Design an enzyme around this catalytic site. Structure first.
Site, short mmCIF file in Angstrom:
data_model
loop_
_atom_site.label_atom_id
_atom_site.label_comp_id
_atom_site.label_asym_id
_atom_site.label_seq_id
_atom_site.Cartn_x
_atom_site.Cartn_y
_atom_site.Cartn_z
N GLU A 1 0.82 -1.20 0.00
CA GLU A 1 0.00 0.00 0.00
C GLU A 1 0.87 1.26 0.00
O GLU A 1 0.54 2.25 -0.65
CB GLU A 1 -0.93 0.00 1.21
CG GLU A 1 -2.12 -0.95 1.09
CD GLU A 1 -3.16 -0.47 0.09
OE1 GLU A 1 -2.92 0.56 -0.57
OE2 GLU A 1 -4.21 -1.13 -0.04
N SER B 1 -10.87 11.58 -4.06
CA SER B 1 -10.47 11.18 -2.73
C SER B 1 -8.97 10.92 -2.70
O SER B 1 -8.34 10.77 -3.75
CB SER B 1 -11.24 9.93 -2.29
OG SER B 1 -11.31 9.88 -0.88
#
Length: 129
Positions: free
Chosen positions: A35, A50
């Site tokens: 990630e 976002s």
């Protein structure tokens, strides 16, 4: 920054994340890896405008506030910048809530495409508990 392989495994640990609703310590480790590459300051804007925040890439449209994503809720009642801290507590806490949301670790694309259903322990091998 970034964080260390076993520096993190040990940091996530005593933040009580090691077997958290089933998920071995290794999954979180492996999650952080893909990630954000263990980078706490990591940031990524998605298409919806976002932005993903922090070591486990936690989204602004739900969990954290960044005054920049309209029609969002900040579910962990926390500003997104606090997730970019070298201190892990904020990130972990909000993660813990995301896993009991009902859909588990699958809440991370990276995880269920690069960790799930794989030998996940090699990620914390040799590390000092």
């Amino acid at each position: 920054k970034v964080f260390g392989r076993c520096e993190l495994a040990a940091a996530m640990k005593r933040h009580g994340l090691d077997n958290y609703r089933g998920y071995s310590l290794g999954n979180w480790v492996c999650a952080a890896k893909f990630e954000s590459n263990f980078n706490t300051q990591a940031t990524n804007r998605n298409t919806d405008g976002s932005t993903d925040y922090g070591i486990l890439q936690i989204n602004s449209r739900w969990w954290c506030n960044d005054g920049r994503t309209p029609g969002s809720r900040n579910l962990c009642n926390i500003p997104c910048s606090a997730l970019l801290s070298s201190d892990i507590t904020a990130s972990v806490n909000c993660a813990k809530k995301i896993v009991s949301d009902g859909n588990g670790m699958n809440a991370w694309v990276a995880w269920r495409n690069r960790c799930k259903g794989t030998d996940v322990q090699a990620w914390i091998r040799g590390c000092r508990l």
